[PDB]
RNA sequence: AUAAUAGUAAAGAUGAAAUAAUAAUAAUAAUUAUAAGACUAAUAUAUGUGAAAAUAUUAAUUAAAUAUUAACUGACAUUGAGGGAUUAAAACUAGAGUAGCGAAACGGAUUCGAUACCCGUGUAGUUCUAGUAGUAAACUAUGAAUACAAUUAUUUAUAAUAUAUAUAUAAAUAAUAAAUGAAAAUGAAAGUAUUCCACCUGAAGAGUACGUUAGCAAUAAUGAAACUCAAAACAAUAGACG
């Protein structure tokens, strides 16, 4: 089951912002692969400012680093990945959402589909 | 079947009401017989086999390949701003099916209410089924057939 | 069962297909093995939905009950198909 | 299977087209007539 | 609206009156109406051909009439959903008249927008009187236009000089163009001749246009000044 | 039922409810032990 | 009957062909897909360390 | 048959369209077939359409979309300005030639694009036009400056030696009032069907 | 709601006023900072979806769902007494929860009076979890199913057309024809017909009493008679009236 992810990570360090994001991406990707899963794409997005001053437990955030991870897994695995994301202090907002494979097998991320490229083959070419 | 017969009668009445010329009916044996009887008495202008889409010009043999799409086209009849086939009330309804002996049919013909049937009228036609063959009630009397009083057209 | 696949696939057939593709490419290893593993993971039952598993069970039931290969509406096969869903 | 289906039909259509030919074909073999022709065609293929 | 009995049964109603003695004298119309009876048979009559095309309305293509394989290679062995539905409304609803020429007309005016600006009289002269041999484009009663082209194309198609429709159309277009060029040259040279021999035209077309624009501009100016004044206040 | 007709029914229902409220202690006495 | 059998089988065959095509496409893609740790690390490096093609709109 | 006659006949000849009669966008060529009457036929309100047309219309020309609508009125507009633009263009006598090196389309599945010009000019470029005074080298045409210049039913790009201040700056945005003379250099025609004229202001 | 900041005499309320956990113990307004419950702005048309109750912040899981084709089954269907399951709001029994709202109660107004309408405190309740109960203007005041009948305009989906055209289908929604109807009006049903179930037979008395069953209970279902009238009811009409 192809699940897209959107995590808005924390950026504490000013000079080197992407490090925490990169670590998060590594860890969640590691979890996925240990657990019968297959990460397809890890689309980065920019250091984008949040719409409002969004706050985690005993913290506050105005800017964050955004990224999509487009992975396959079981439902239980995914649910648990989501839970771990919710638990951790270095992400502000997390959101897993299903990508339906009833018609196709190759499906790109939501952003790529919006641009034009339906399958990841198109992106490759 | 008798429900089918009632439905076709209702359809005929509807078509008479709005003045359509040429009308489809389901393609069964009983239904065909009924249509033929109407034609011979003089209520229908035409009677011809055909498709669900229209009446057939040439002969087309009916098989399992066709049968579901097959249909019985029937011409209706009008004169001096009045339809010929005004009514098609049936008598033997599916729930209370009535089967008269020859004497009862004779009585009906001669102006006697029987089994709550209004006795048959001047320009009317009571059809009668007798051994899977629809006839006029007068014809049935002549032949002496105890039969199911099917329906009534006026 | 352990190497059962969703989407109307069969593991033996998939491997053969992959081998044929490899042969075609050669005509015209570790990485290839990793790709094959990824494919299997994608098409596995245990990562897929329950719906696919049910469909497979229904198909199996049909195969068991069918009084000939063409028939799918056999009162017995219909009952069998109902049972899996139930 | 598709080729078999085609062959039976095409032969039948040819038989329908030519009446003189049809009778000769029937003799060589050994609505009713059409059915017999069809049966012969099936036997052949 | 219900079918009125009383508009067509007039003579019967009067005949009854005459019989009674309510009417002493017969009307002038009475004998005439007796001689020429009304229709009084207000039926919905079915139609089996489209007159424009010549397509058959009533018939249904059977499973036995379609022996060969379909697109996507499936043999029709059953009636479909639409083949079971009783298509009686098609017999009664009047046919949409279609012509091959309409498409050609549409194409022509897409290709030649400024042919639309050539004014068209639609008030017909005797349609029976005409007799055009479409061997050529220039007919006498008819002017030169896209219609004439299209008629020429149709003639070519009929005669099978050009078996293809497109080629015939192109040919007709090319015939038209030469004629148009000739027409254009005629007018210009006639104008030149007129200029040479001391003819005097009081108002040229462009001058007329300028004059027309001028009045509108004058109207605009006074209004615009008033609007500016209003805006200021 | 029009609204006017309903209003008689409503009134009746109210009266009944009142009677039930009145005869609560009496009803209780009647119910228990017999 | 023969025609009906053909119709049944042809559609199944087509579906099978489609499934095979889809599988082939997946296989073609799958060099980009990740299962092992090293591959994942490489992907991460490509994404983050390069500092290029961050999906941001303007 | 009747059907054949109908197909031939003058209403079938008018190619149907449901384009707006009011189009406030850019108009590069005629949208609708102009339809004239004779004066006699106008006098008894007959245009060769389904219905009579209102006696309020006194112009002989019009444009229409529907013979009859649900509103029980023919959708028309009483105007045939496009013919006059064409006639003005003809009078100006500047022959349209493709600025791109291509053969003239009138000489030698379907292409809906405009074949050369749309038929506003079937004139050929090689001719001169003599007069009593002589052979006309420069085509003199009166037009109006807008701010571009309106020259005989066409807007045209303009060029000059020096920008005249006395005429322009005296009435900055009322330049449309005063008609100026123009020397039309050439007329090119683009893919969209717009006639791109080029004029020169004379003083 | 609590706390801090700075700041000054009113604040809050109403038709106008007061009473109050309001305010010279320093409020209200403002800016911050914590917590708590409960609700879900636009999109929205309840369009649609659901058997009906219902159902619009997001996501995931599991379940069910549309159309057209292909193949198969071969009348296996319809309706459905009894029966079964679900069934708004209020109510009740436990155990949490309780911001706002708010029966009751108390207080202030209003008023001749004011057990009210308005204002203030505000308990049950409203919220969740597990149940009970099985009623509502639970309404489209219209039981379910099938065959059929004249038009138009709107959308929605399907197919072909040579992706954007004008076409053929269905589906819904809105105007109608006919037909029906006490009329209002219904309009593919309140039409033409067939099938099956539920229910009605003047008004009061009465969905009351007695009885029985079920419920923790409130109650729910079942459901009479005497007594008394020539009444009682609906659609529409024309007034008078507001
Ligand atoms: Mg009632
Ligand atoms: Mg219902
Ligand atoms: Mg909302
Ligand atoms: Mg039922
Ligand atoms: Mg509600
Ligand atoms: Mg409650
Ligand atoms: Mg409680
Ligand atoms: Mg209160
Ligand atoms: Mg319950
Ligand atoms: Mg109750
Ligand atoms: Mg009730
Ligand atoms: Mg409700
Ligand atoms: Mg009426
Ligand atoms: Mg009735
Ligand atoms: Mg209505
Ligand atoms: Mg009793
Ligand atoms: Mg009770």
DSSP assignment of E50-74, as one string? -TTT--BSS----STT--SPPTTS-
Task: For residue G36, count CB atoms less than 10 angstroms from its CB and return exposed for 0-12, middle for 13-18, buried for 19 or more.
Answer: middle
Looking at chain A, which residue has its C-alpha nearest residue G37? A30
* CA-to-C1' span, B86 to I199 (A): 35
Rounded to whole angstroms, the Cα distance separating A108 from G55 reads: 14
Q: What is chain C written as a DSSP string?
A: -TT-BSTT--HHHHHHHHHHHHHHHHH--HHHHHHHHHHHHHHBTTTS-HHHHHHHHHHHHHHHH-SSSS-S--HHHHHHHHHHH-
Q: Are strands H195-202 and H155-159 parallel, antiparallel or unpaired?
A: parallel
* CA-to-C1' span, A54 to I166 (A): 54
Taking contacts as CB-CB distances below 8 angstroms, the residues of chain B near E40 are 80-81
From the C1' of I64, which residue's alpha carbon is nearest? C85
> Across the interface, do G8 and C8 touch by the CB < 8 Å criterion?
no
Instruction: For chain A, give the number of residues.
Output: 125
Q: At a CB cut-off of 8 Å and minimum separation 6, what does H136 contact?
A: H128, H129, H130
Q: Report yes or no: D29 and E88 within 8 Å, Cβ to Cβ.
A: no
H168 φ, ψ to 5°? -75, -60
Q: Which residue among E44, E59, E90 sits closest to B19, beta carbon to beta carbon?
A: E44
Q: How far is CA E183 from CA E166, E180, E196, E211, H91, in A?
A: 26, 5, 20, 28, 14
Question: What is the C-alpha end-to-end distance of chain F, expressed in Å?
Answer: 41
* Cβ of residue B23 closer than 8 Å to a chain E Cβ: yes
Taking contacts as CB-CB distances below 8 angstroms, the residues of chain E near D6 are 68
Taking contacts as CB-CB distances below 8 angstroms, the residues of chain G near E71 are none
Rounded to whole angstroms, the Cα distance separating A69 from G39 reads: 15
Q: Report yes or no: C10 and A6 within 8 Å, Cβ to Cβ.
A: no
E180 φ, ψ to 5°? -60, -45
Dihedral sign, Cα of residue E144, residue E147, residue E151, residue E156: positive
The CA C80 to ligand 13 mean position distance, Å, reads 56
| Beta pairing partners, B127 | B136, B151
Rounded to whole angstroms, the Cα distance separating B24 from B47 reads: 10
Q: How far E60 CA lies from chain D's nearest CA (Å)?
A: 21
* CA-to-C1' span, A66 to I5 (A): 37
* Cβ of residue A34 closer than 8 Å to a chain G Cβ: no
* CA-to-C1' span, B9 to I76 (A): 29
Looking at chain B, which residue has its C-alpha nearest residue E87? B53
Question: What is the C-alpha end-to-end distance of chain H, expressed in Å?
Answer: 66
Q: Which residue among C9, C34, C42 sits closest to G36, beta carbon to beta carbon?
A: C34
- E180 three-class SS: helix
- Strand I, nucleotides < 7 Å from a protein CB: these are 34, 58-64, 68-73, 76, 137, 141, 146-153, 162, 166-170, 177-179, 191-196, 204-208, 218-219, 233-235
Q: What is B16-53 written as a DSSP string?
A: HHHTBSEEEEE--HHHHHHHHHHHHHTS-SEEEEEESS
Rounded to whole angstroms, the Cα distance separating B51 from E62 reads: 9
Q: How far is CA C70 from CA B9, C74, C82, G10, G14, in A?
A: 42, 10, 19, 13, 17
- Closest ligand to C-alpha of residue F1 is 1
The CA F11 to ligand 17 mean position distance, Å, reads 17
Taking contacts as CB-CB distances below 8 angstroms, the residues of chain H near E97 are 3, 6-7
* Cβ of residue D27 closer than 8 Å to a chain E Cβ: no
Q: Resolution to 1 decimal, in Å?
A: 3.8
Residue with tokens 């009162």: C75
The CA F13 to ligand 10 mean position distance, Å, reads 10
A60 φ, ψ to 5°? -145, 145
Taking contacts as CB-CB distances below 8 angstroms, the residues of chain E near D9 are 67-68
Which residues of C, range 25-84, sit inside 8 Å of G by Cβ?
31, 34-35, 37-39, 41-42, 70
> How many Cβ atoms sit within 10 Å of the Cβ of residue A52?
8
**Backbone φ/ψ region at A89: left (φ over 0), alpha (ψ -120 to 50), beta:** alpha
Rounded to whole angstroms, the Cα distance separating H176 from H164 reads: 15
From the C1' of I58, which residue's alpha carbon is nearest? A95
E44 φ, ψ to 5°? -95, 110
| Beta pairing partners, A68 | A6, A43
What are the CB-based long-range contacts (under 8 Å, 24+) for E147-150? E147/E105, E147/H13, E148/E176, E149/E108, E149/E173, E149/E175, E149/E176, E150/E101, E150/E104, E150/E105, E150/E108
> Across the interface, do E77 and G10 touch by the CB < 8 Å criterion?
no
The CA F4 to ligand 17 mean position distance, Å, reads 25
Residue with tokens 């000739």: E182
* Cβ of residue E174 closer than 8 Å to a chain G Cβ: no
Rounded to whole angstroms, the Cα distance separating G38 from G32 reads: 13
Which secondary-structure segment (H or E) carries B147?
strand B147-153
Taking contacts as CB-CB distances below 8 angstroms, the residues of chain E near D5 are 69, 75
> How many Cβ atoms sit within 10 Å of the Cβ of residue E83?
19
Chains with at least 3 CB pairs less than 8 angstroms from chain H: E
> Across the interface, do A38 and C44 touch by the CB < 8 Å criterion?
no
Taking contacts as CB-CB distances below 8 angstroms, the residues of chain G near E77 are 3-4, 7
Q: At a CB cut-off of 8 Å and minimum separation 6, what does A50 contact?
A: A8, A61, A62, A63, A64, A92
Helix, strand, coil share of chain A (percent; to 5): 35, 35, 30
> Taking the C-alpha atoms of B87, B92, B95 and B98 in order, what is their torsion angle to the nearest 10 degrees?
160
Closest CA to H127 of H97, H84, H157: H97
The CA angle H158-H163-H164, to the nearest 5 degrees, is 115
Looking at chain A, which residue has its C-alpha nearest residue C49? A1
Rounded to whole angstroms, the Cα distance separating B34 from E72 reads: 44
Rounded to whole angstroms, the Cα distance separating E117 from E119 reads: 6
Tokens representing residue B26 in the block: 């389901």
* Cβ of residue D2 closer than 8 Å to a chain E Cβ: yes
> Alpha carbon H2 to chain centroid distance?
36
* Cβ of residue E3 closer than 8 Å to a chain B Cβ: yes
Q: What is A10-39 written as a DSSP string?
A: ----SSSTHHHHHHHHHHHHHHHHHTT-EE
**Backbone φ/ψ region at E160: left (φ over 0), alpha (ψ -120 to 50), beta:** left
> How many Cβ atoms sit within 10 Å of the Cβ of residue E39?
8
> Across the interface, do E79 and B69 touch by the CB < 8 Å criterion?
yes
* Cβ of residue E63 closer than 8 Å to a chain D Cβ: no
Rounded to whole angstroms, the Cα distance separating B52 from B31 reads: 15
> Across the interface, do D5 and G9 touch by the CB < 8 Å criterion?
no
DSSP 8-state symbol, B7: H
Rounded to whole angstroms, the Cα distance separating H107 from H98 reads: 14
Tokens representing residue H80 in the block: 């045939």
The CA E155 to ligand 16 mean position distance, Å, reads 100
Q: How far E123 CA lies from chain H's nearest CA (Å)?
A: 4
The CA angle B17-B22-B27, to the nearest 5 degrees, is 105
């Amino acid at each position: 089951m192809l699940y897209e992810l959107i995590g808005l990570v924390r950026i504490t360090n000013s000079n080197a912002p992407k490090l925490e994001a990169k670590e998060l991406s590594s860890t969640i990707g590691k979890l996925i692969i240990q657990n019968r899963g297959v990460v397809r794409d890890i689309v980065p997005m920019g250091i984008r400012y949040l719409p409002k001053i969004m706050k985690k437990d005993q913290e506050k955030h105005f800017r964050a680093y955004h990224f999509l991870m487009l992975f396959d897994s079981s439902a239980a695995v995914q649910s648990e990945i989501l839970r771990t994301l919710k638990k951790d202090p270095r992400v502000i907002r997390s959101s897993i959402v299903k990508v339906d494979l009833d018609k196709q097998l190759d499906r790109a991320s939501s952003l790529h589909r919006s641009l034009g490229k339906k399958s990841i083959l198109e992106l490759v070419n | 079947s008798l429900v089918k017969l009632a439905n076709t009668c209702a359809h005929l009445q509807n078509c008479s009401k709005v003045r359509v010329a040429l009308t489809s009916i389901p393609y069964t044996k009983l239904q065909l017989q009924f249509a033929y009887n109407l034609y011979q008495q003089g209520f229908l202008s035409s009677l011809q086999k055909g498709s669900t889409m229209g009446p057939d010009k040439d002969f087309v043999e009916v098989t399992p390949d066709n049968i579901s799409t097959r249909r019985l086209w029937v011409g209706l009849k009008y004169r001096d701003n009045k339809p010929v086939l005004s009514s098609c009330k049936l008598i033997s309804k599916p729930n209370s099916r009535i089967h008269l002996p020859m004497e009862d049919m004779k009585k009906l013909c001669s102006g006697v209410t029987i089994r709550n049937i209004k006795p048959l009228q001047p320009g009317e036609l009571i059809l009668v089924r007798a051994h899977n063959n629809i006839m006029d009630i007068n014809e049935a009397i002549s032949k002496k057939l105890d039969g199911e009083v099917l329906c009534r057209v006026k | 069962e352990p190497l059962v696949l969703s989407k109307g696939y069969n593991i033996e057939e998939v491997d053969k297909f992959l081998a044929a593709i490899e042969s075609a490419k050669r005509e015209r290893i570790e990485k290839l093995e990793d790709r094959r593993e990824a494919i299997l993971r994608i098409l596995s039952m245990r990562n897929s939905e329950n719906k696919n598993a049910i469909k497979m069970a229904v198909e199996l039931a049909r195969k068991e009950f069918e009084r000939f290969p063409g028939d799918t509406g056999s009162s017995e096969v219909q009952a069998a198909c109902m049972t899996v869903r139930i | 299977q598709r080729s078999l289906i085609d062959r039976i039909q095409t032969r039948l259509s040819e038989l329908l087209s030519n009446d003189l030919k049809c009778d000769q074909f029937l003799k060589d073999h050994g609505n009713i007539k059409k059915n017999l022709l069809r049966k012969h065609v099936m036997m052949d293929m | 609206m219900k079918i009125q009995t009383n508009a067509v049964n007039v003579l019967q109603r009067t005949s009854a009156y005459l019989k009674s003695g309510l009417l002493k004298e017969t009307p002038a119309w009475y004998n005439v109406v007796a001689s020429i009876p009304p229709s009084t048979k207000f039926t919905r009559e079915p139609r089996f051909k489209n007159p424009s095309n010549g397509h058959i309305i009533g018939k249904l293509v059977d499973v036995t009439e379609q022996p060969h394989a379909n697109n996507k290679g499936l043999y029709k062995t059953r009636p479909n959903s639409s083949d079971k539905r009783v298509g009686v409304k098609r017999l009664y609803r009047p046919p949409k008249l279609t012509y091959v020429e309409d498409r050609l007309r549409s194409l022509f005016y897409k290709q030649h927008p400024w042919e639309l600006s050539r004014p068209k009289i639609l008030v017909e002269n005797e349609i029976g009187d005409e007799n055009y041999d479409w061997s050529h484009m220039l007919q006498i009663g008819r002017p030169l236009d896209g219609e004439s082209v299209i008629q020429r194309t149709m003639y070519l198609i009929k005669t099978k000089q050009y078996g293809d429709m497109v080629e015939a159309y192109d040919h007709a277009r090319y015939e038209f163009y030469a004629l148009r060029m000739q027409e254009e040259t005629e007018q210009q040279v006639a104008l030149e001749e007129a200029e040479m021999f001391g003819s005097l035209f009081g108002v040229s077309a462009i001058e007329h246009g300028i004059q027309k624009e001028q009045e509108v501009l004058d109207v605009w100016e006074k209004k615009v000044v008033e609007e500016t004044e209003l805006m200021a206040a | 039922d029009s609204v006017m007709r309903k209003r008689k029914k409503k009134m009746k229902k109210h009266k009944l409810r009142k009677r039930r409220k009145r005869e609560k202690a009496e009803r209780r006495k009647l119910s228990q032990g017999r | 009957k023969l025609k009906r059998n053909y119709n049944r089988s042809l559609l199944n065959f087509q579906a099978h062909k489609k499934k095979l095509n889809e599988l082939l496409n997946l296989y073609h893609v799958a060099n980009e897909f990740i299962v092992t740790e090293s591959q994942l690390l490489k992907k991460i490096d490509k994404v983050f360390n390069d500092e290029t093609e961050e999906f941001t709109d303007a | 048959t009747l059907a054949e006659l109908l197909g031939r006949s003058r209403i079938a000849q008018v190619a149907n369209n449901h384009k707006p009669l009011t189009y406030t966008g850019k108009k590069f060529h005629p949208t609708h077939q102009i339809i004239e009457t004779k004066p006699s036929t106008l006098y008894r309100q007959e245009w060769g359409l389904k219905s009579a047309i209102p006696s309020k219309i006194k112009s002989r020309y019009l444009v229409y979309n529907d013979l009859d609508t649900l509103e029980r009125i023919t959708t028309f507009e009483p105007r045939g300005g496009t013919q006059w633009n064409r006639l003005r263009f003809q009078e100006m006598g500047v022959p349209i030639v493709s600025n791109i090196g291509r053969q003239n389309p009138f000489f030698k599945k379907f292409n809906t694009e405009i074949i050369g010009t749309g038929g506003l000019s079937y004139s050929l470029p090689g001719k001169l036009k003599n007069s009593p005074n002589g052979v006309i080298q420069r085509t003199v045409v009166p037009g109006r400056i807008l701010n571009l210049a309106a020259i005989g039913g066409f807007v045209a790009d303009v060029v000059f030696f020096q920008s005249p201040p006395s005429s322009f700056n005296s009435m900055g945005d009322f330049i449309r009032m005063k008609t100026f003379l123009f020397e039309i250099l050439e007329a090119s025609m683009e893919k969209n069907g717009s006639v791109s004229m080029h004029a020169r202001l004379l003083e």
